[PDB]
Amino acid sequence: DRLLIRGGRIINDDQSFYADVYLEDGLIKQIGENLIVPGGVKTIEANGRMVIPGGIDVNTYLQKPSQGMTSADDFFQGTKAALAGGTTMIIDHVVPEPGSSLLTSFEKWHEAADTKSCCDYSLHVDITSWYDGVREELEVLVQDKGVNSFQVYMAYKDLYQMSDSQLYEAFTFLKGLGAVILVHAENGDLIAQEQKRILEMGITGPEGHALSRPEELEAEAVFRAIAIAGRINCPVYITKVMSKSAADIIALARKKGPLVFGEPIAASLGTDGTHYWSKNWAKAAAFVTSPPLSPDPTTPDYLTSLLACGDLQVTGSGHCPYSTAQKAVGKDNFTLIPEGVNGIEERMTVVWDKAVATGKMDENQFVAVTSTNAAKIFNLYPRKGRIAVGSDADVVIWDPDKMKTITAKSHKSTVEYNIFEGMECHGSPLVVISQGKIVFEDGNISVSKGMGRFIPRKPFPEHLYQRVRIRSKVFG
Amino acid sequence: DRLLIRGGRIINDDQSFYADVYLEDGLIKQIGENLIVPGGVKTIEANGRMVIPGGIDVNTYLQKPSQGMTSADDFFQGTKAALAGGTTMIIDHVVPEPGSSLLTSFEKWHEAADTKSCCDYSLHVDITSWYDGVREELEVLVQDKGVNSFQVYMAYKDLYQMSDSQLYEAFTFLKGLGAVILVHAENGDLIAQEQKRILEMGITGPEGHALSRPEELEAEAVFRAIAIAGRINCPVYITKVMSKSAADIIALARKKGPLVFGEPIAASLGTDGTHYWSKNWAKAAAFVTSPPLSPDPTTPDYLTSLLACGDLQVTGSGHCPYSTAQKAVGKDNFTLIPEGVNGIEERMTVVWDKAVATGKMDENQFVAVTSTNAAKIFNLYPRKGRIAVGSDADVVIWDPDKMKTITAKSHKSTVEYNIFEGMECHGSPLVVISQGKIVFEDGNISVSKGMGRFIPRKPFPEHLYQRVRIRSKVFG
């Protein structure tokens, strides 16, 4: 259906300018000084408000398994929540069941999302084990299924953990396929050692989670992953950056040569781990995620600073909350608490408040860290993350001047708690458009279950492999 | 005049793609897979070669006065050499006399460039002293003449040097006018002291120029510049970054918040100061520029790496050589040697060889550091530094695999020496187009004296001031 947005200020990552935008059949058809559309056309008066590209959440775990329980917000509830918060595309993590192949898991996820997602989506495939034959499936996932990104774990001893030798093999094989390599960086062996010790001191509450996974163990894994990537000459992406230490490791590496990217999430940009010490067991348990929120209160402002100067490039949510009932399964042993916090709905609002409202970065840089950088890294650029003729009509009309107190009573998540409870933000979504259709307006959501399309991605993203290709020919 | 570039691979700072480009009347009229062109239109077959935005040399001193003499390459010779090197625009520094009229010097520089320049140009206005009434003239240059950039000096005691009180006053006023504040950062008092001391010892050769201006003095001046800018909350641009020390200061400051931009030049990116110790006085004196080339051999590679990671954003040449006979006006006292080196013609080839051919950055980042970044900072963005419909037709067909050994025996400058003598680079221009007209093709240059237009620029470049505005409203 034809839709005209008039009087708006278009904000892309490279510049801002006034013009109207004309949408038709999921595409941006025209941008220009004034008029040019048929007489019958629904019209939205932006009246000076910002017209920006819909957000791309590079990290979601909507159907994540944890302690035998599935994350609380499914593909429907989850994407509905995303759209209400201004995010029009997600890249969800496929997590294979024990003893299941990668192709079987992809098919399960794909079928699931296709029947419930309210918006467009892509899929990451989590390689939980380097088994004989995995190489063939990966080739099929890249070449035929359209999956260009994969994650390997450095933590979760005896479960998902990959040894240095296996990590070297995986990075090498993945680079050959032109894939984007993601890492969950925490030293699992040392974490296992600390869990035992902490539980021995009689510490059973959530604070035990933070205490068994100190940031020094995250930073160390990040460094080791960067060392491997550097020897292999392949890009490496660090998911869920939660600490000042890990962030500095990445910063230092960037000026050295290694092609390393950093992904902080809403949680680490908007709150901290002091809440693991709440008297209320349920509130504390709701903050349990891995890596954990840093107990150092200076962390959120510091990570935002690094995102502003370019040492960190994209923002995600790591969304995968569990209800109090599900969390309670470990009311006694903190190591039995399902891991995951909310943030898919709050991401763009939280980033705007902590980065733009404070003056650390401007609106153009806001677009880059919420969509454009993500698009260039995962090979979806022009199509997504840019208001331009020919791109997909995933648009948001943002109003920098007002409204937003984050509360569990008004959020879209099905869970009881919210790690950003009480946070008042200045700047939020007014109108959300996906696939050329209005899904959020006048403070209300209007979605269609299953309307979302799966977006396949080609390997060898230029932003990543151009430098890789030169280096392989210059340093042989 | 109509011109079609066919079969090329367009390279912008944000992406690359195959499409033909159609030029008409100084503008890029169409970009696309094919078709839509009149029969009698001159066509160029790119044959898969790179089609990029013409370079922008943010730093030129074509009519610079020094020791009572004028620089060797004037507006005609200088721009001719720039075009031959792939640079289609320069922003030259107007250098006013002893407390004379800024407006009058502007008028003189403008008249010369409009009569001699081969390509479009803009003008910087150097504030050689804060004489009473300078404010009034500055306001006119900005609002009426279209000058949005001004440079202040921290060196040259009793000549151009401004005190901290004056610097503070100038940054504050210039911020008020929304200008881009450039700084020549070296501690003039300490340099004056060391010059005396070095001469007293009997060291009068060019090595004394380097010895009397150690990088510790450039770094301290740079640090102090940023400190003032932080208190005032205004953007600050560091011209001619020549040392690792100075580059590290800027890098640390970027993570802290202050809006600081760094400008390394061809000289510091492609050679070093070991040549000041050359037996050949003439050769050594040819390297005399301030700040001086660093004697540390590791400097060029280091600066290139920080340019690639984003700590330094633009590249200039600082072109303003003097013939040997002119330099020789101080063969018995290095303090009387006219300051200035070559680089305007070599800039893009040198940057390509040190940054892209080594794999530190790819072709898109190359475009950013040679034109686009400069365009955004100086408010010339969409029109310059981008291959898009509506932008000026300043284009270059670049061949990534075609050697070019730089020699004074064949360079376009008029001077006898070349600081890049013997350097063999792998990447040079094949065709250069200015204002939609071919000025370089088949190895031959064809330019029209006085064809270049003066490009006026508006104050308050969004890229710089959006953040400034937020900060002013949040930290009062």
UniProtKB/Swiss-Prot annotation, chains A, B:
Entry-annotated residues carrying Phosphothreonine: T87, T88
Locations listed in the record: Cytoplasm; Cytoplasm, Cytoskeleton, Microtubule organizing center, Centrosome; Cytoplasm, Cytoskeleton, Spindle; Cell projection, Growth cone
Alphabetical GO biological process terms: negative regulation of neuron projection development; regulation of postsynapse assembly; semaphorin-plexin signaling pathway
Sample GO molecular function, one term: filamin binding
Residues with PTM 3'-nitrotyrosine: Y302
GO cellular component: actin cytoskeleton; centrosome; cytosol; dendrite; growth cone; midbody; neuronal cell body; perikaryon
The entry's keywords: Cell projection, Cytoplasm, Cytoskeleton, Nitration, Phosphoprotein
UniProt motif Required for interaction with FLNA: location: 232-233
UniProt keyword Cytoplasm present: yes
Physiological role: Necessary for signaling by class 3 semaphorins and subsequent remodeling of the cytoskeleton. Plays a role in axon guidance. During the axon guidance process, acts downstream of SEMA3A to promote FLNA dissociation from F-actin which results in the rearrangement of the actin cytoskeleton and the collapse of the growth cone. Involved in invasive growth and cell migration. May participate in cytokinesis.
Subunit-structure text: Homotetramer, and heterotetramer with DPYSL2, DPYSL3, DPYSL4 or DPYSL5. Interacts with PLXNA1. Interacts with FLNA (via calponin-homology (CH) domain 1 and filamin repeat 24); the interaction alters FLNA ternary structure and thus promotes FLNA dissociation from F-actin.
Protein name as it appears in the record: Dihydropyrimidinase-related protein 1
